[PDB]
Amino acid sequence: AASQAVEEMRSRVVLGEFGVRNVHTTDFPGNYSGYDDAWDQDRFEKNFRVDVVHMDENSLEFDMVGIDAAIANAFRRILLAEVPTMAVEKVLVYNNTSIVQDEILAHRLGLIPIHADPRLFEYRNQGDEEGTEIDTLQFRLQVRCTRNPHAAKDSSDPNELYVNHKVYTRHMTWIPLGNQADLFPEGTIRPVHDDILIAQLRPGQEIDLLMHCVKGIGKDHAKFSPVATASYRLLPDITLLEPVEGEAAEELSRCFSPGVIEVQEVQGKKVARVANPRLDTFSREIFRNEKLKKVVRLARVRDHYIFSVESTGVLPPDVLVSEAIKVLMGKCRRFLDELDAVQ
Amino acid sequence: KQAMGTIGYNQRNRIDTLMYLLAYPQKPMVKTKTIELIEFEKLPAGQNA
Amino acid sequence: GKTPAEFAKLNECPLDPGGYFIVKGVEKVILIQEQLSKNRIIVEADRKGA
Amino acid sequence: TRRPEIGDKFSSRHGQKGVCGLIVPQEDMPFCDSGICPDIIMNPHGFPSRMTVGKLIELLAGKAGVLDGRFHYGTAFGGSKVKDVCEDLVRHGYNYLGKDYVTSGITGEPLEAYIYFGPVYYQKLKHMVLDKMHARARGPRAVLTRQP
Amino acid sequence: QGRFRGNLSGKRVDFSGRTVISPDPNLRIDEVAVPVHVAKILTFPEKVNKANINFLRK
Amino acid sequence: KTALEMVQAAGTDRHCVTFVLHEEDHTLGNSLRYMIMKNPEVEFCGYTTTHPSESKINLRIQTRGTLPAVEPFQRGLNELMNVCQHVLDKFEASIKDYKDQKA
Amino acid sequence: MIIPVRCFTCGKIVGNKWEAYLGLLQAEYTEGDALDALGLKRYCCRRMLLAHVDLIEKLLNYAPL
Amino acid sequence: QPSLHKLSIMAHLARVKPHRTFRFNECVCTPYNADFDGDEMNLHLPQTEEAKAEALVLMGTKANLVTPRNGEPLIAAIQDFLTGAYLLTLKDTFFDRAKACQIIASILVGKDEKIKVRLPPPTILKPVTLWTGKQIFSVILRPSDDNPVRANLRTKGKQYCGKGEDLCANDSYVTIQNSELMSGSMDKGTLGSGSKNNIFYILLRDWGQNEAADAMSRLARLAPVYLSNRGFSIGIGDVTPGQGLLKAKYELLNAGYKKCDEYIEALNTGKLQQQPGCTAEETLEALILKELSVIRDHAGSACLRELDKSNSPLTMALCGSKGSFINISQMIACVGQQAISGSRVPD
Amino acid sequence: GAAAWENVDSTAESCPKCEHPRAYFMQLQTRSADEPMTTFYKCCNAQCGHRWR
Amino acid sequence: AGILFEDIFDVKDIDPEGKKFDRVSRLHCESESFKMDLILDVNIQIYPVDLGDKFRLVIASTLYEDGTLDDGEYNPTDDRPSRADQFEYVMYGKVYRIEGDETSTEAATRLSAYVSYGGLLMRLQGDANNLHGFEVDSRVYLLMKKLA
Amino acid sequence: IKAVFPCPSEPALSKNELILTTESIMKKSEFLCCQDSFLQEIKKFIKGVSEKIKKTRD
RNA sequence: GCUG
Ligand SMILES: [Zn+2]
Ligand SMILES: [Zn+2]
C-alpha cells in the first residue's frame, strides 16, 4: 500500500537502471505523517550494534547498524584527515651525490611511514626548528656504493657487480635524543615497511642525510594520513520479487557476483535463493537481461554500513577507529567550552 | 609537443637554456602502434589519472 | 653504427634522431622547403581574367 | 621543483585542455565502494559540443586494461572494440559501461546518478602561472620615448 | 611602432598587471580576486585627511 | 575566538542567529546539522562554507518560536558527544570480544 | 624515474612491491596474476606497477660512477 | 586582450586572496569571451579619485548588464548554472525539509548573512511533507520577507508544443507570479544570456541593477550545490546507439543509396528533369544531396525518440546549456555531408 | 520557384521564433574558433521569414 | 466551514501523452454531481492512482474547520484536530489564473480556474456558479481521499 | 502592475470607464512633456484592452 | 617560431 511505499522511501536506497532512488536521509521530525523522528538516546543505544566481520594486521572490517550517514561519513573523514601520525618534515642533506634530485629525495623520505606511536609525541610549535626529545625523532641515512671486490667477470647483474647499489628503508638508523632511548626499547621506533626503495646508487656515489620526524594531521599533508583507504558501503539487500526456477536461475546466478546467488534443486528443479548479499558488487548486469530485470529488486539498507579500514602499518587499525571517535568528541567539547566562555 | 616529460637518457648530463622534466612519468595505458614504432613508451610524458 | 653501450661513453641517447647540426653549441635543423616544380608548363588565369 | 597549483595547465590527449581551478582534500572527494576517489574531476559539459567520444572510450579501455594487466590498443581505424572491453569489466565485477555507485564525501549520502570512473592519460603542459604572473608599479623606461 | 600609433594612440602604462584567470563562483559578479603578490605591488596614493588618519597609521 | 554569534538583525532577534565556527569543515557541520535538525523546535538549520580557502563554517539556526537558538545549538553538541561516547564503548567491547573468540 | 613510494590516489605503499613484481614477471607469472600475488586488488594501485617505466637503470649508465 | 566592444573592459571591486590567479564569477565570462584554458587577463589600478568614480559609475558590471548593441543581457547564467537550474525546476523533483534547508542555506553567505530565510509552506502535506524544487528556486528571487521584489514573467520555453497555453505536456511554459515559479522549467531562454524574457533582464528594469546582480550571485551559489550532490555524468552508454536506430539506419541507408543510383542512371543515360536554371550535373547534385540529407534527418529523429530521459547528452540540448540536437544526431546516428565552401568535395 | 527552394532535407522541425513546420535549414562548421556548432534556419510556412543562428 | 468546492471525481485517463515523468502523473478526471472536468498532477510515488479509481476532492481555504484563517506559518510538528485527518492526500498552492472558455462566441458560463501546487498544476473547469469563491492570488488546500 | 498591485477592494472598470480614466490621467503635464506619438501608442493599447473587456462582458 |  502507500504505507509500504513510504517504508521503502525511509529505509532502502533502491538502485535502478538509470539512477539511484531514495538517496536522501528523510528521518527528521515532522517529515512523515505517522512517524515520530525526534531524537531518542534510548532508542539509538538499543538499535546500535558494531560487529567485527574480519580483523587482520593492517585491515579491519566492521559493520555499524543504526548509525546515520552524516555521523558515519565524519568517522571516515576524521580517519583520513584528523588522526595524527609522525612523518619526516625536514631533511638535512650533506654530500648527496646520487642521480636522484635532493628535492625529489626529500619528498620520497616524507612519504615513508614511521612505526612510532603518535600519542606519546607532542605537536611542534610554529618555528622552533631545533625541536625537543618530546616533539621529534631523528633518523640518519648514510650509504656509499662500492664495487664488490670479489666479483664474476661478466657482472651483467648490478647486484653481483655492486654493493649497496640500492638504498632501502632498512638503512635508515634511529638516533635517540635525550631520554627517548630508555622510553622506547630497541626496534620500537623503525620505518614500518623495511623494503621501500628510497634511491639507487652506482660505485663512488654517496647519500648522507639526517631526517626530523614531527606529529601532523592529514589535512596539512597526505604524508601524515594513517589509513591507506577508509571507506563505507551500505549493505546490499537483493530481493527476488517473483520466484525464479529453471535455466533462468543459472542466468540470474551469472548476472550477480560469484557467491551471492545459490541455485538449489528443491524438487530436482533448479530454484534461486539469495545466500550472501554482502558479497554483491552492484555491477547491475541484471538490467542487461530483459526478462530478469522485472523479477529482482536491487536495494541497499540505508542504516547498515560495512566499514573497511586499511592501515599503513603506523598503528593497529582498531586503535585508529577508536582515536577517530575521540577526535570528533574533542571537537564537540571544544565548542561547548567556547559557549561556556561566551556565556 | 608541449607536454612535460623526459628528453632522453643523457638529460642529466645535458645543460640547456630551459628544460622541463616530470618526476614520476608513466607510460600510456592505451596506446597506438605508432607509440611502439617511435618508442615513446621508453621515455613517456604523462601520468594516468 | 655504435651500440647503446657505446652511446653511453659519448653521452648520447640512442633514441635521439639526429638529422640536425650543432653550430656554436645550438642545435639547428634545416627544415624541408616545399617548392614548385621547375620546367613545367603552368596554364593559369591572369588577374584580368585572360 | 614545482608542485601543481591553481592556474597550471593540464591536458588530456584529446584536445580537452584545461587550467586547474580548485584543489580539494581527499576527505571531500566523492568515493566509490572500493574506496577510490578521483585524482581529477572532469566536467561532462566538454563532451557534447566537442564530440570527443575517443576520450570516453579511452577511459573504458584503460579501466578494463588495468584490471587484468593489459595495454589495450587505440590505433586509428582499428583498436580494441567496446564489445570486448565491456566483457572484461563485468568479469572483474565492475559495470560494463564503467559507471559506478558513488557516495558523496561532503554529506555521506549517495549520489543519484552513477558516475563514470576510469584512468585517463593526462599530460602536464609547460604553461605555469608562476612563470606568467607580472606586475609593474613604476619602473624603468625607454630612452627615446620616456614610456615603459 | 611609429610615434602616432606606437607611442601616442596606444601606449604602455604603469600600475598594471597580468596573470592566468581561473573560476570562482563564490565571488559576486562585481568582484575580482587579486593575489597578494600583485596587491603588495599595485599601490594607490591615499591622501591623508580627518577620516583616514587613524586607518593609514596602522 | 572560535565561535562568533551574529544575530540576523540590528534588533538582535534571538530566534535567528548565525554561528561562525572557526577552524571547522563539513565533518563537524554535517554531523551537528543532523543532530540539531532532529530537534522539533529548529525550523531551519544549514551550514555554508564562505570560501574553500577559509576554514570557517557559518551555521544558521532559525527556531520555531521564542527559543534563543543558543539552546538548540548547545543541545545538538551535547547529543553528538553522547552518540560518540556510546559508539566508542560499543566498538571497543565488540573488538575485545572478537579477539577473545580468535584466541 | 624510480617507483613512486605511495600510490597517487589511494595512498597504499607500492615502493616495496617493485622488486617482487619484477621477479614474478621473470618467472612464468602473468602480469595480472603477478599484481594479484602482490595484493594490489584496486585498479588505482595496479596501474602504478603496470604503467611504471624504470628509467633509473638507463639514466645510471650515463652517471659518473 | 582583444577588445571588440566596450564590455571587454569593466571595473571590479578587488578582494585579496592567497592564490596567484585572477578569479571572477563565471557569469561574467560571456562579456570577456574568456574560457579558463590558460587564458590571461590584464588589470589596471586607477591612480586618481576622479578615475575611480568614472570607472565605478560608468564601467561597473552592474551598470553594464546589457550590451549597447541590441540591448540584450550578457552577464547571465552559463553551463552548470542552467543545467542545475533546469534539473532543479523539473516536475519530478521533491525535497523533504532536511534537504530543502540544506540547499537554501547555501545562499546565507556575504550580505545575505543577516536575513531571515523564509522557508515557504510545503506543497504536499498528508502522505509526506514535500517541497517541489520550483519553490527552492523561488528563494533566489525573494529570499526574505522584507525583500520588496515582486518579479513577473510569462514566456514560452524552448520545447513548447505550441498549443498547451500553460498546460503543455513538456512543462515548457514559464509563469513567475510574485517571485514564485508557478510552472515551467528554466532554460537558456529564461536564465541565460541569449535574449530577453530572461528573469534577470526583467528584474534589472523592474527592480534596478542592484536587485538583478544579487539574484545572479544567489543562483551561482545554489546551482553548483544541487548538481554537485545530485550528480551529472556522461558515459559511453549515453552515446551508444540503441537497437531501434541500428535497424532503422540500415533500412534508411539502403533505400537512400538505391534511389541515388537511379538518379545517377538517368543522367548517365537519359533524361533527368533539369531543375529551373541549372545544368543536368547541377541537378543531379541537388537531387542526391536532398536524398542523403533526408536520410540523415530520418536517422536523427529515430535516435532521439528512443533516447531515455536522464541521458545526459539529451538534457544539455533541451536546456540549451551546451550542444544541440544536430550534435547528438551527429555522434550517435549519422555525420552529415561534409561540405567545403558550400559544396561537395572538389576534385 | 518554391520547390526549387525547398529541395533541401529539413521539414517539421522547430525554430525559436515562430515554430512552423515548413522550414529550410543550414549547418556550418568552418570556423574552428567556434568550438560549438553553427546553424542557420529559414522558416516559411506562414511566410514569416526568420533567419537566425 | 472554509470550503470552496467539493465533489466526487472519477479518473478517466492517467497519461494522455505518455509517461513524461516518474513521480508525477497527469490525471484527467470527470465529476458525477456537476459537469466538472479536472486536470490534476499528483505524486504517484507516495500516492498511487489507478485508471478506474473514484475519489473525493475538497478544496478549502483553511485546514481548521472552525474557520480561523490564521496561517502565519504552517508547523508540521504541531498536532491538533484538523480537516486533513479525514483525507489521505493534501497539497498547498495558489490560485493564479481565472480564464474564460473561448469555445463559444455567445451566451457562455464555463470558467477555468488554475491552481499551481509548487509546479504541480490543476485546471478546474465548470459552471461559474460552482467555481464561486475563487479569486486570483488566493491560497488553497487541496484534499483528496479515494473511495472504495 | 495587475500582479504587483491587485486591488480586491476596488471595482472593475467597464470599457467606457477605462477610456475616461486614461484620458483624465493623460491630460497631466508630465505626459504632455513625453512625445505625442508615444502617448498615442498608449491610448491605442488602452483602446484595445477596453474592446477586450466589452467582448467578455457581452 | 610560438603562445595568448
Ligand atoms: Zn591505489
Ligand atoms: Zn522563423
| Alpha carbon of residue E52 to chain centroid | 20
Closest CA to G38 of G59, G7, G8: G7
Furthest CA-CA distance within chain H: 84
CA distance to D18, D37, D122, E32, F7, per residue, from D9 (Å)? 6, 22, 11, 21, 44
Chain B touches chain C, with at least 3 Cβ pairs below 8 Å, answer yes
Contact E55, H56 (CB under 8 A): no
Q: Tell me which residues have their CB within 5 A of the ion that is ligand 2.
A: I 15, 17-18, 43, 50
CA atoms of E24 and D7, how far apart (whole Å): 12
Q: Which helix (H) or strand (E) holds F56?
A: strand F56-63
The span from the CA of D115 to the CA of D42, in Å, is: 11
Contact H172, H160 (CB under 8 A): yes
Residue A188 domain boundaries:
85-227
Q: Kind and range of the H or E element at F99? A: helix F70-102
Cα gap J11→H173, rounded to integer Å: 25
Q: Judge whether A293 and A17 are in contact, CB under 8 Å.
A: yes
Q: Are F44 and F60 within 8 A, CB to CB?
A: yes
Helix (H) or strand (E) holding H203: helix H199-207
Q: Chain H: which residues have CB within 8 Å of chain I?
A: 158-160, 162, 189, 275-277, 286-287, 289-290, 293-294, 296-297, 322-324, 326-327, 336, 340
Task: Go through J65-75 and write b for each residue having 16 or more CB atoms within 10 A of its CB, e for each that does not.
Answer: eeeeeeeeeee
Task: Look up the CATH number of domain I2-52.
Answer: 2.20.25.10
Nearest to J24 by CA among J91, J98, J97: J91
Give the distance, in angstroms, between residue D4 CA and nucleotide L3 C1': 20
For A15, H234, J75, K56, the CA distances from A286, given in Å and listed in that order, are 11, 21, 44, 61
d(CA D9, CA D84) in angstroms, rounded, equals: 34
Residue of B nearest to D123 (CA): B46
Secondary structure E strands in chain E: 16-23, 31-35
Residue H315 Cα to ligand 2 midpoint, Å, equals 24
Q: What is the largest CA-CA distance in chain G?
A: 40
Strands laid side by side in the I23-28 sheet? I23-28, I38-43, I50-52
Give Cα separations from F82 to A41, A45, A167 (angstroms).
Answer: 8, 10, 50
SS3 J99: strand
CB A128 within 8 A of CB A229: no
Kindly report the CA angle at G34 between G28 and G35, in degrees rounded to 5? 165
Q: Is H238 annotated as a binding residue?
A: no
Burial bucket for residue B10 (CB in 10 Å: 0-12, 13-18, 19+): middle
State how far the Cα of D58 lies from the Cα of D74, in Å rounded to an integer.
8
**Please, which positions of strand L sit below 7 A from a protein CB?**
3-4
- Helix, coil or strand: residue H7: helix
Rounded Cα–Cα distance for residues A180 and A45 (Å): 43
Estimate in Å the CA A102 to C1' L2 gap, whole number: 33
Give A132's contacts (C-beta < 8 A, 6+ positions apart).
A177, A178
Contacts of E26 in chain F (CB under 8 A): 50-52
SS3 at position F93: helix
Single out the residue of J144, J113, J115 nearest to residue J131, CA to CA: J113
**Residue showing cell 465533489:** J7
Is the separation of the CB atoms in A145 and A203 below 8 Å? yes
DSSP H stretches of helix in chain C? 4-7
Tell me the structure's resolution in angstroms, rounded to a single decimal: 3.6
Residue J95: helix, strand or coil by DSSP? strand
CB A311 within 8 Å of CB A62: no
How far apart CA B13 and CA B15 sit, in angstroms, is 7
Rounded to a whole number of angstroms, the CA Rg of chain A reads 28
Instruction: Give the residue among H155, H160, H193, H161 at the shortest CA–CA distance from H174.
Output: H155
d(CA H144, CA H119): 9
Residue whose C-alpha cell reads 631545533 in the numeric block: A130
* Chain K residues inside the 8 Å CB shell of H150: 3-4
Grid cell in block for residue A239: 530481493
d(CA H62, CA H60): 5
The ligand minimizing its distance to the Cα of G13 is 1
Residue ranges covered by each domain of chain J: 5-148
Q: Which residues pair with A140 in a beta bridge?
A: A173, A210
Cα A54 to chain centroid distance, Å, stands at 14
Instruction: Report the DSSP beta bridge partners of residue C22.
Output: C27
Rounded Cα distance, H287 and J70, in Å: 73
How many C-beta atoms surround the C-beta of residue A251 within 10 A? 15
Q: How many CA atoms lie within 13 A of D99 on its CB side?
A: 22
CA of I50 to the centre of ligand 2 (A): 4
CB-based contact H5:H64 (threshold 8 Å): no
Give the domain extent around H211: 81-230
Distance between alpha carbon J75 and the CA centroid of its chain, in Å? 22
Grouping H, G, I as helix, E, B as strand and the rest as coil, residue E7 is helix
Q: Is H282 helix (H, G, I), strand (E, B) or coil?
A: helix
Is H106 in contact with H221 (CB distance < 8 Å)? yes
CA distances from A305 to A73, A229, D28, D108 (A): 10, 16, 19, 11
Tell me the torsion sign for CA atoms G35, G38, G43, G44: negative
Of the candidates H142, H117, A32, the residue with the CA atom closest to the CA atom of residue F43: H117
Q: D40 φ, ψ to 5°?
A: -135, 140
* Alpha carbons J91 and J83: distance in angstroms, whole number: 12
User: Distance between CA atoms of B21 and G1, rounded to whole angstroms?
Assistant: 10
Of H4, H7, H10, H3, the C-alpha closest to H59 is: H10
Beta bridge partners of A51: A63
- Report d(CA K50, CA A109) in Å as an integer: 86
Count of CB atoms situated within 10 Å of the CB of J130: 19
If you measure CA to CA, which chain H residue comes closest to D5? Answer: H19
Q: Check if the beta carbon of residue F87 is closer than 8 Å to that of residue A50.
A: yes
Tell me if A6 sits within 8 A of J46, measured CB to CB. yes
> In this structure, are strands A12-15 and A166-168 parallel, antiparallel, or unpaired?
unpaired
Cα I47–chain centre separation: 13
H256, containing H or E segment: helix H243-268
- To which residue does cell 459552471 refer? J127
Q: What are the CA-CA distances from residue A214 to residues A131, A227, F58, G29 (Å)? A: 9, 18, 32, 41
List of residues 6+ apart from J78 with CB closer than 8 A: none
CB atoms within 10 A of CB A72: 19
3-state DSSP of chain A: CHHHHHHHHHHEEEECCCCEECCCCCCCCCCECCCCCCCCHHHHHHHCEEEEEEEECCEEEEEEECCCHHHHHHHHHHHHHCCCEEEEEEEEEECCCCCCCHHHHHHHHHHCCECCCCCCCCCCCCCCCCCCCCCCEEEEEEEECEECCCCCCCCCCHHHHEECCEEEHHHCEEECCCCHHHHCCCCCCCECCCCCEEEECCCCCEEEEEEEEEEECCCCCHHHCCEEEEEEEEEECCEECCCCECHHHHHHHHHCCCCCEEEEECCCCEEEEECCHHHCCCCCCHHHCHHHHCCEEEEEEEEEEEEEEEECCCCCHHHHHHHHHHHHHHHHHHHHHHHHHHC
Residue with cell 525573494: H142
The SS3 of residue B48 is strand
Neighbours of H257 (CB within 10 A): 12
Residue K17 belongs to what H/E stretch? helix K15-26
In angstroms, the CA A325 to CA A83 distance is 10
Strand L contacting residues by CB (7 Å): D 127; H 1-2, 37-40
Task: Enter the C-alpha cell of residue D133.
Answer: 604572473
| 8 Å CB contact between A112 and A105 | no
Note the residue count of chain J: 148
- Type and span of the H or E element at H267: helix H243-268
Task: Give backbone dihedrals phi and psi of J113, rounded to 5 degrees, phi first.
Answer: -110, 135
- Taking the CA of residue B8 and the nearest CA in chain C, the distance in Å comes to 6
d(CA C40, CA C33): 19
Neighbouring CB atoms inside 10 A of H305's CB total 11
Q: Which three cell numbers stand for residue H226?
A: 544541487
Q: How many CA atoms lie within 13 A of H23 on its CB side?
A: 25
**Parallel, antiparallel or unpaired: strands B30-31 and D72-73:** parallel
The DSSP code for G60 is H
Q: Which of D25, D106, D114 sits opposite A81 (nearest CB)?
A: D25
Experimental method: cryo-EM
In Å, what is the CA distance from G54 to each residue of A185, B8, D67, G28, G65? 39, 13, 21, 21, 19
Distance of alpha carbon H184 from alpha carbon J60, whole angstroms:
25
Round to whole Å and give the CA distance between H20 and D133. Answer: 7
Q: How are beta strands H13-17 and E31-35 bridged, if at all?
A: parallel
Identify the nearest ligand to the CA of G49 by its number. 1
**H60 closest CB neighbour out of E30, E34, E45:** E30
Q: How far is CA B1 from the centre of its chain?
A: 11
What is the DSSP-derived secondary structure letter of residue J100? Answer: E
Who among F25, F30, F52 is closest to D107 (CB)?
Answer: F30
Rg (CA), chain B: 12
Q: Is the CA virtual torsion A310, A316, A322, A327 positive or negative?
A: negative
Lookup: cell for H312: 545526459
Helix (H/G/I), strand (E/B), else coil: D123? strand
Integer Cα distance of H318 and J111 in angstroms: 34
